[PDB]
Design a protein around this ligand. Structure first.
Ligand SMILES: CCCCCCCCCCCCCCCCCC(=O)OC[C@H](CO[C@@H]1O[C@H](CO[C@H]2O[C@H](CO)[C@H](O)[C@H](O)[C@H]2O)[C@H](O)[C@H](O)[C@H]1O)OC(=O)CCCCCCCCCCCCCCCCC
Ligand code: CLA
Ligand code: CLA
Ligand code: CLA
Ligand code: CLA
Ligand SMILES: C=Cc1c(C)c2cc3nc(c4c5[nH]c(cc6nc(cc1[nH]2)C(C)=C6CC)c(C)c5C(=O)[C@@H]4C(=O)OC)[C@@H](CCC(=O)OC/C=C(\C)CCC[C@H](C)CCC[C@H](C)CCCC(C)C)[C@@H]3C
Ligand SMILES: CC(C)=CCC/C(C)=C/CC/C(C)=C/CC/C(C)=C/CC/C(C)=C/CC/C(C)=C/CC/C(C)=C/CC/C(C)=C/CC/C(C)=C/CC1=CC(=O)C(C)=C(C)C1=O
Ligand SMILES: CCCCCCCCCCCCCCCCCC(=O)OC[C@H](COP(=O)(O)O)OC(=O)CCCCCCCCCCCCCCCCC
Ligand SMILES: CC1=C(/C=C/C(C)=C/C=C/C(C)=C/C=C/C=C(C)/C=C/C=C(C)/C=C/C2=C(C)CCCC2(C)C)C(C)(C)CCC1
Ligand SMILES: CC1=C(/C=C/C(C)=C/C=C/C(C)=C/C=C/C=C(C)/C=C/C=C(C)/C=C/C2=C(C)CCCC2(C)C)C(C)(C)CCC1
Ligand SMILES: CC1=C(/C=C/C(C)=C\C=C\C(C)=C\C=C\C=C(C)\C=C\C=C(C)\C=C\C2=C(C)CCCC2(C)C)C(C)(C)CCC1
Ligand code: OEX
Ligand SMILES: [Cl-]
Ligand SMILES: [Fe+2]
Lengths: 242, 49, 36, 336, 31, 76, 348, 31, 67, 30, 38, 30, 48, 31
């Protein structure tokens, strides 16, 4: 029988059950993000933006919420020391509740994929067996990642639609969330330059879109398919982990 | 609490040797502008200079 | 083609190796690194 | 005809039918050890503080006196006793017997007798099972190490307080003070011991990987490969020729073990002889033979001292030496 | 010559003898 | 096949190794006895460890001008 | 392969030449292993022979200065260089090989080439195991010391101020590095190091006990007093009695192995797990996340001066290491620490 | 930390122990 | 026997049909060599900029880059 | 309160040792 | 392939593996309790 | 412009390509 | 009720956890790549 | 009893749930 450390090997050959367990893990991660944000807001003391900031209070995902734009809270305060007149729906608790309801919906989707696993979409019609066209799935995922990265780099960080990112003075005294102009020069590869992030995300998104379109268009070769075992799920698991 | 400036009897400005990252307990040394050790909190406190 | 005995070759090589190691050990008491 | 009481007792003692073989070595191994475990559990739980250095500064060492598992340790005997024998009857009261470190001597003596008779019992069961008897010869290396760190070093330094404390933080204290005294890192015997344990880990991984890699396919991928091995079988479970060929084209062809008997003998002999060497290194340090001393060895043409890595090790030894037993030295030279 | 065995032995044998000669020479270097 | 039992027992092997190995030994001897080792590897001689400007261990204390500063702090 | 014609090309010719029996197997990994490992070992042997340490550490670390095999080392670069890769074409060496040897770039050369040689050697075990059709448990085990090398020689100095606090390649320099973690980190007290010690000691015990058990539970197969000539490689029978071994260790120790595959897997598992735990501990120490003190015991000892333990003795000893080490261990700090402030006990 | 560590230790000594007991009894009751 | 037929499954059906349909020969592995070597060059460039082993006219590689 | 936790963990460990020694699965020898 | 799942597997954990798991958990707890309690 | 560090880096890339070609030539020369 | 010893930043905890997880996933990638290349011999050897 | 309640409630949950789970998987293992 299967040993205790081989239990998940039951879903190597099942794409529907694989999607179900991926959704279950993804729901667990989203629920943890929401629960952690609620816990940190519950134990958070905003009574000193200067001498007792969030990194002095051991806040983990609060800087990550802050860095991308979430600065106001539903508690009627702002981490910069101001007063939130109307934080809207995208506050710290708002993002946490959104993560919680996303976790619930993903749990329901995981249950549905666990039950309705036998979908002929997972079966190739040439032989009737269950198989996945991993190069084409990778092309779709790379194309989607390219669109998402380019949108994040051209609409969120640049501020034409989003709020921008956290920009400050070199000594970190003021600090705020501003839209940032992309630096297409060598200074854009300056690690401390905030303008590198929009330029990098725009260029990487465009190149990922092109690579995904190429992967959708062109099939692999005999030598590569038999060498890296592109028809195997442990190969893509190994490389994704890498 | 404000910046601490240390002075000896004849008026030279001594400064503390800031403890590096690797050390958790560091000997306290008040060393001058020229880099000569002028005062400390001596562990010996007998035949201490 | 097997003219010289392998045991004699090994004895000569081991003698040179032992004498060379003795030379190195003698060099630890004279010259540099000998505290003198 | 086996009716007399001593014949029946001898047959029961030498009986291989017991769950654990006792034997005539076990008739000493069992009571001495169970004495040592009993007093060791009791001391580790509720031992009052012990004046290890003889300077009337006691060390708690026990959990009920505020120690955790890492810091908990049976403290060595008082330095005033030294190498004197201190049983309970040689003390007027249990209070001073515990204050002076008597449990440490009792545990050390009973443990030495127990490991010696465990080695004898290993030989005895090898004899009564028709086996070759050198398993006890292999076990003579950890026994040598324990004797060197519990009895031989106290003998060489003149005090049981100088032995390894029965614990974890006490063990680290023993190692640190020992480095201060003897510079054990710079000793060839300790170097062979370190090479032996590192090579023992290497060879354990090598042999296990070679055998587990070369198991004959007798199961599927949904069941454990261990289920392919049936106990009591005579058929071989792995390809010795394939494993030897893999090792030969991995490292060297003519410098590889093509014989499993020689390979297993090498696996047996390497860490055992290296632990023998390091136990003898500790025992030679007990008589103050010490490691390599290279303090101020590299000197330039003008005679100025050129410091080396051995000089930095000397600085570490100084830092340990000026701090170990911070109140037990009334004089500069540490001859005790 | 010009074999893999020859090259593999020589790449670790020629510098070994050269360095052994150098270390033997510097044994006799006095202060 | 040359299982090392023929090459190590042949005078044909040993007539050319009776000159090459001693030649390499003499080359290694002269490489350090002529100061070439100190030249190419930058190791200081026993008489040049300390200069007149400094009587202690040198310190690099810089990164981007380390070449020029180690040239200044070396024994010329 | 796979009922295809598979027209021969230069790749197939190269694969055919690389995967051929010879003295030292090359393979594809030999295109990286042989130069990387050869240059790493040769660089270490050259640094231990000629290249000095007078400018990086102010120390003698080669045979040409008077150091022997134990005290010679390829020294780490200076802390002011930080984590610079110290290329010979970099901004520090700038093409000068002689000054590059004096700048400590040989350490970075040897370390990077040795890391890539470790990668190539484990790829070599992978490629040989695929050539002879064996499972790669050898390099699954060899993943452990590569992780140890990475965590110790790369991850730890990367987390610290620079390559200066990396281990210099040499015996006494490793001893200095070891005593440095004793004094500055209390690396013995770290539970991950505790698991590493347990793994190595258990692996050595397993190796010794398995060799002794096999060699002492052998079958006769004799007509000769030397058992080593009583073995035939081409056979399908066991030469040591597993049943007798199991009975002996069940009646001596209490438990015994009944599965040879599980026994050898355990002999694989113990050192790999121990070395990986030690690597995790060194990664923790890379950020000075030390298991240095027990806080409750510290407050108890501070509020009650009659409470002495071996742990407090170790704390005092580590303070002694840091104090009597810093001045001559870190020349960049310029710690001209006076005598009167150095901790010192009664007399001695 | 005096009792939060107690709770963490309790959870660590039960949850995988209970899980292992589930698997062990699930195998032991099947012949 | 066919599985559970769904409109979404029939819509995404041609996206997963050619399981095992590959190109003959080596395909675009020269393009593999070109792309992978340029990516290694770019990655090395990034590493040298961030390690300060390569200095440019416009980069600073410090917190005053925020200035 | 910590000492009782330590003593409980160690007596549980000795219990597992005694259990593994004396109530182990017998070898089947089949 | 059918209405029931064809990849129906039985998880096994024998008594010796139970011994190893219990010892692993208890020894890990003994080792890390002094650090968690601090 | 072309800094000295960038120029030395480009020459390093050229030298790496040269030594890779030399290794390939030594391999194909058997 | 602070104890008096210095603590670690969220940056430090992030880096420590991610480096430990990075080495663990290096091992995971090794194990899965070994299972990838050696999938046919995962149950043993061919013995032929 | 602020956290004595924690440890009491914890063990009161743990002991019967582990007991019931063990005997249940004993039942369910044999078909
Ligand atoms: C590129 C492809 C993007 C596809 C997803 C688009 C989702 C979206 O456009 O939806 C965007 C959503 C919701 O954003 C909404 O955005 C609205 C519009 O805000 C605007 O407010 C002002 C209106 O004048 C300014 O124009 C300002 O730039 C802009 O932010 C609201 O005001 C709120 O901010 C908010 O509810 O967020 C999100 O990014 C969700 C994105 C998930 C990934
Ligand atoms: C996203 C990465 C990833 C993925 C998808 C997989 C997937 C898989 N692994 Mg793998 N592995 C990974 C990473 C990953 N692994 C890493 C990083 C390591 C190094 C530690 C390993 C080491 C490893 C080994 C040694 C083995 C597998 C095996 C397997 C297969 C069966 C797993 C199973 O049922 O065990 C069951 C798991 C449990 C019963 C619980 C384990 C308890 C853990 C130790 C503590 C609980 C963790 C906690 C809940 C969450 C923390 C994780 C999070 C912070 C990331 C499966 C397909 C097995 C295999 O090869 O199949 C034949 C196997 O032998 N993996
Ligand atoms: C579209 C839905 C959505 C949205 C809008 C958000 C939004 C947010 N999430 Mg979130 N999350 C989601 C889904 C979503 N999440 C899901 C489904 C999960 C479960 C997996 C999570 C789990 C999660 C966690 C655990 C956390 C968040 C956090 C956050 C907040 C900060 C994000 C951050 O950390 O920045 C940065 C994000 C990154 C650095 C990700 C980098 C992606 C890498 C670089 C991709 C590279 C690989 C790629 C394939 C290569 C492409 C190749 C190219 C050529 C194309 C933010 C408000 C954080 C938080 O603060 O809690 C509230 C937090 O810790 N989320
Ligand atoms: C890698 C991700 C990550 C990181 C970087 C952090 C970082 C941080 N967390 Mg957090 N946390 C995480 C994941 C993470 N957390 C998750 C997944 C959870 C859900 C369980 C939590 C729940 C959580 C809470 C409730 C709290 C924090 C808090 C904190 C902050 C204080 C430091 C600390 O954690 O104590 C020290 C960390 C350690 C000592 C790590 C232990 C080292 C290893 C894991 C031990 C090895 C395991 C061992 C075998 C187990 C045996 C022990 C047994 C005997 C009991 C810190 C910045 C505290 C805070 O400041 O409030 C915001 C706080 O109260 N975290
Ligand atoms: C101990 C190291 C190690 C080992 C044994 C393996 C082993 C394996 N890897 Mg892997 N890999 C590694 C490290 C390692 N890798 C690292 C660090 C990465 C980056 C995260 C990768 C990324 C990776 C990917 C993406 C893939 C593999 C794959 C594989 C498998 C196929 C064989 C192969 O192509 O190997 C790998 C070959 C190498 C590691 C050689 C690379 C070395 C280059 C050529 C030298 C570069 C030097 C250059 C001058 C840079 C120096 C600059 C300086 C400043 C540092 C195999 C099981 C493939 C697979 O299918 O898995 C099943 C695959 O998909 N690996
Ligand atoms: C310090 C102890 C130690 C040493 C010296 C060592 C050495 C070795 N192990 C090997 C193998 C193994 N090691 C294994 C498990 C282990 N090995 C361990 C510990 C060690 N392993 C431990 C603890 C384990 C258990 C996890 C396995 C499983 C294998 C093998 O498969 C293999 C073998 O067949 O063994 C018989 C050999 C193949 C190395 C090689 O060619 O790489 C290529 C050469 C390189 C990379 C050049 C070295 C450059 C190094 C990394 C940096 C420079 C260092 C200088 C050259 C020397 C500095 C010396 C000072 C530090 C004193 C090599 C002799
Ligand atoms: C009051 C009291 C009690 C005070 C003491 C307090 C105290 C000191 C507490 C601490 C105690 C404690 C356990 C501390 C250790 C903590 C610690 C560091 C734990 C490490 C934990 C851990 C997971 C580490 C990871 C590394 C790891 C996996 C280690 C495993 C080590 C391990 C079990 C090794 C095996 C040891 C060993 C004895 C093997 C014997 C093997 C054996 C029986 C072989 C015989 C044999 C051989 C054959 O060849 C054949 C053929 C047969 C048939 C056969 O039989
Ligand atoms: C949490 C609270 C519960 C904790 C549970 C802890 C349990 C500890 C109980 C104390 C252990 C004492 C075991 C004594 C068993 C004697 C019976 C026997 O050995 O077989 C008889 C058996 C009888 O013959 P047979 O039944 O025909 O096989 O053989 C013998 O006569 C040998 C007698 C050996 C005597 C030595 C006693 C065992 C020493 C090792 C115990 C070490 C103490 C530490 C315990 C943990 C490590 C194991
Ligand atoms: C042990 C430990 C660890 C791990 C950890 C983890 C793994 C974590 C976690 C965690 C988690 C995992 C958490 C969580 C949470 C969750 C939640 C909180 C959830 C949710 C959900 C909900 C609530 C839903 C609801 C609903 C439904 C039901 C459906 C419909 C919709 C709705 C929404 C209504 C480590 C190793 C790291 C170390 C440290 C410690
Ligand atoms: C650095 C570098 C490089 C590289 C190099 C190389 C790679 C080489 C080499 C080299 C080498 C590789 C050397 C060596 C050395 C060695 C030696 C010096 C040896 C030894 C040994 C001994 C001395 C001992 C012996 C003995 C005896 C007699 C007794 C008993 C046994 C024994 C074995 C112990 C180049 C320039 C390219 C570039 C730049 C960088
Ligand atoms: C280890 C080994 C080996 C070997 C090595 C060697 C090299 C050895 C040697 C050795 C030798 C080379 C020896 C010699 C010797 C001599 C002798 C042993 C003698 C004698 C005698 C006597 C007793 C004397 C006397 C006298 C006197 C008293 C005085 C004067 C007169 C006379 C001289 C008469 C080999 C590698 C092969 C193989 C492996 C193992
Ligand atoms: O007791 Mn334990 O450690 Ca033999 O040295 Mn003298 O005494 Mn005391 O000092 Mn150093
Ligand atoms: Cl002490
Ligand atoms: Fe074996």
């Amino acid at each position: 029988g299967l040993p205790w450390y081989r239990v998940h090997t039951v879903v190597i050959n099942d794409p529907g059950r694989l999607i179900s367990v991926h959704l279950m893990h993804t729901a667990l991660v989203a629920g943890w993000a929401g629960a952690m944000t609620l816990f940190e807001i519950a134990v958070f003391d905003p009574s000193d933006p200067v001498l007792n900031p969030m990194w002095r209070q051991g806040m983990f995902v609060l800087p990550f919420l802050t860095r991308l734009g979430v600065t106001q809270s539903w508690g009627g305060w702002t981490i910069s020391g101001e007063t939130s007149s109307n934080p809207g729906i995208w506050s710290y608790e708002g993002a946490a509740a959104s993560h919680i309801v996303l976790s619930g919906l993903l749990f329901l989707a995981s249950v549905w994929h666990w039950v309705y696993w036998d979908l002929e979409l997972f079966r190739d019609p040439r032989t009737g067996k269950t198989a996945l066209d991993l190069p084409k799935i990778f092309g779709i995922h790379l194309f989607l990642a390219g669109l998402l990265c380019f949108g994040f780099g051209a609409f969120h960080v640049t501020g034409v639609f989003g709020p921008g990112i956290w920009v400050s003075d070199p000594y970190g005294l003021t600090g705020s969330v501003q839209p940032v102009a992309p630096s297409w020069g060598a200074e854009g590869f300056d690690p401390y330059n905030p303008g590198g992030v929009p330029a990098h995300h725009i260029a990487a998104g465009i190149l990922g879109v092109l690579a995904g379109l190429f992967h959708l268009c062109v099939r692999p070769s005999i030598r590569l398919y038999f060498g890296l075992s592109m028809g195997s799920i442990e190969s893509v698991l190994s490389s994704s982990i890498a | 609490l404000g910046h601490a400036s240390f002075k000896d009897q004849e008026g030279r400005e001594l400064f503390v040797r800031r403890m590096p990252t690797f050390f958790e307990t560091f000997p306290v040394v008040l060393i001058d502008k020229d880099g000569v050790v002028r005062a400390d909190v001596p562990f010996r406190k007998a035949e201490s200079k | 083609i097997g003219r010289i005995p392998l045991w004699l070759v090994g004895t000569v090589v081991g003698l040179l190796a032992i004498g060379l190691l003795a030379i190195f050990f003698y060099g630890s008491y004279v010259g540099l690194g000998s505290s003198l | 005809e086996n009716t007399s009481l001593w014949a029946r007792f001898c047959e029961w003692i030498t009986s291989t039918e017991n769950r654990l073989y006792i034997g005539w070595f076990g008739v000493i191994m069992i009571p001495t050890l169970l004495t040592a475990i009993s007093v060791y559990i009791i001391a580790f739980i509720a031992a009052p503080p012990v004046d290890i250095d003889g300077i009337r500064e006691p060390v708690s060492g026990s959990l009920l006196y505020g120690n955790n598992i890492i810091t908990g340790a049976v403290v060595p005997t008082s330095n005033a006793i030294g190498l004197h024998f201190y049983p309970i009857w040689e003390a007027a009261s249990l209070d001073e017997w515990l204050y002076n470190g008597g449990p440490y001597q009792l545990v050390v003596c009973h443990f030495f007798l127990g490991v010696c008779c465990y080695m004898g019992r290993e030989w005895e069961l090898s004899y009564r099972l028709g086996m070759r008897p050198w398993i006890a010869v292999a076990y003579s290396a950890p026994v040598a190490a324990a004797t060197a760190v519990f009895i031989i070093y106290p003998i060489g330094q003149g005090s049981f307080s100088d032995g390894m404390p029965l614990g974890i933080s006490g063990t680290f204290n023993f190692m640190i003070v020992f480095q201060a005294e003897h510079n054990i890192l710079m000793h060839p015997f300790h170097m062979f011991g370190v090479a032996g344990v590192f090579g023992g880990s290497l060879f354990s991984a090598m042999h296990g990987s070679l055998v587990t890699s070369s198991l004959i396919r007798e199961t599927t991928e949904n069941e454990s490969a261990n289920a392919g091995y049936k106990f009591g079988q005579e058929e071989e479970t792995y390809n010795i020729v394939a494993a030897h060929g893999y090792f030969g084209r991995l490292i060297f062809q003519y410098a590889s073990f093509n014989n499993s008997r020689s390979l297993h003998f090498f696996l047996a002999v390497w860490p055992v002889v290296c632990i023998w060497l390091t136990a003898l290194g500790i025992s030679t340090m007990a008589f103050n033979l010490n490691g390599f001393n290279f303090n101020q060895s590299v000197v330039d043409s003008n005679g100025r001292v050129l410091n080396t890595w051995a000089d930095i090790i000397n600085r570490a030894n100084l830092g340990m030496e000026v701090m170990h037993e911070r109140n037990a030295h009334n004089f500069p030279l540490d001859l005790a | 010559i010009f074999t893999v065995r020859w090259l593999a032995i020589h790449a670790i044998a020629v510098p070994t003898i050269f360095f052994l000669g150098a270390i033997t020479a510097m044994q006799f270097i006095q202060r | 096949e040359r299982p090392f039992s023929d090459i190590l027992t042949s005078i044909r092997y040993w007539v050319i190794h009776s000159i090459t190995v001693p030649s390499l030994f003499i080359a290694g001897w002269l490489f350090v006895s002529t100061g070439l080792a100190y030249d190419v590897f930058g190791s200081p001689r026993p008489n040049e460890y300390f200069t007149e400007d400094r009587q202690d261990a040198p310190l690099i204390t810089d990164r981007f001008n380390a070449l020029e500063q180690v040239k200044k702090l070396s024994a010329q | 392969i796979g009922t295809y014609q598979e027209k021969r090309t230069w790749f197939d010719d190269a694969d055919d030449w690389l995967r051929q029996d010879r003295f030292v197997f090359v393979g594809w990994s030999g295109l990286l292993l042989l130069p990387c490992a050869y240059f790493a070992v040769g660089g270490w042997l050259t640094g231990c022979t000629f290249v000095t340490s007078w400018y990086t550490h102010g120390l003698a670390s080669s045979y040409i200065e008077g150091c022997n095999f134990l005290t010679a080392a390829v020294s780490t670069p200076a802390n002011s260089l930080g984590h610079s890769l110290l290329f010979v074409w970099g901004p520090e060496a700038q093409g000068d090989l002689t000054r590059w040897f004096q700048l400590g770039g040989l350490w970075a050369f040897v370390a990077l080439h040795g890391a890539f040689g470790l990668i190539g050697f484990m790829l070599r075990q992978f490629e040989i195991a695929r050539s002879v059709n064996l499972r790669p448990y050898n390099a699954i085990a060899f993943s452990a010391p590569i992780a140890v090398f990475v965590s110790v020689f790369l991850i730890y100095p990367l987390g610290q101020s620079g390559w200066f606090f990396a281990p210099s390649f040499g015996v006494a320099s490793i001893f200095r590095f070891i005593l440095f973690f004793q004094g500055f980190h209390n690396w013995t007290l770290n539970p991950f190091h505790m698991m590493g010690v347990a793994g190595v000691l258990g692996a050595a015990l397993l190796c010794a006990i398995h060799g002794a058990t096999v060699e002492n539970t052998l079958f006769e197969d004799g007509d000769g007093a030397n058992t080593f000539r009583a073995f035939n490689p081409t056979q399908a029978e066991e030469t040591y009695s597993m049943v007798t071994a199991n009975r002996f260790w069940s009646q001596i120790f209490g438990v015994a192995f009944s599965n040879k595959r599980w026994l050898h897997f355990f002999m694989l598992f113990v050192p790999v797990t121990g070395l990986w735990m030690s690597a995790l501990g060194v990664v923790g120490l890379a950020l000075n996340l030390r298991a240095y003190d027990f806080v409750s015991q510290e407050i108890r000892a501070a509020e009650d001066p009659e409470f002495e333990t071996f742990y407090t003795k170790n704390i005092l000893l580590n303070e002694g290491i840091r104090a009597w080490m810093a001045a001559q261990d870190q020349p960049h700090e310029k710690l001209t620490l006076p005598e009167e402030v150095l901790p010192r006990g009664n007399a001695l | 930390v005096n009792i939060l560590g107690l709770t963490a230790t309790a959870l660590f000594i039960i949850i995988p122990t209970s899980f292992l007991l589930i698997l062990y009894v699930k195998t032991a009751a099947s012949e | 026997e066919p599985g559970i037929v769904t409109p979404l499954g029939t819509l995404l059906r041609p996206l997963n049909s050619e399981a095992g349909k590959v190109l003959p020969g080596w395909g675009t592995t020269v393009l593999m060599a070109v792309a992978i070597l340029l990516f290694a060059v770019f990655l090395l460039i990034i590493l040298e900029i961030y390690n300060s082993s390569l200095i440019l006219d416009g980069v600073t590689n410090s917190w005053e880059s925020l200035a | 309160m910590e000492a009782l936790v330590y003593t409980f963990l160690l007596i549980g460990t000795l219990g597992i040792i005694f259990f593994s020694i004396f109530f182990r699965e017998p070898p089947r020898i089949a | 392939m059918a209405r029931p799942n064809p990849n129906k597997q039985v998880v096994e954990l024998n008594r010796s593996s139970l011994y190893w798991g219990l010892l692993l958990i208890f020894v890990l707890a003994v080792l890390f309790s002094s650090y968690i309690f601090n | 412009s072309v800094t000295p560090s960038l120029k030395n880096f480009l020459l390093s890339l050229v030298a790496g390509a040269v030594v890779l070609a030399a290794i390939a030539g030594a391999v194909t020369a058997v | 009720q602070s104890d008096g010893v210095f603590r670690s930043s969220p940056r430090g905890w992030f880096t420590f956890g991610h480096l430990s997880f990075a080495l663990l996933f290096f091992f995971g990638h090794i194990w899965h790549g070994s299972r990838t290349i050696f999938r046919d011999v995962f149950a043993g050897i061919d013995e032929d």
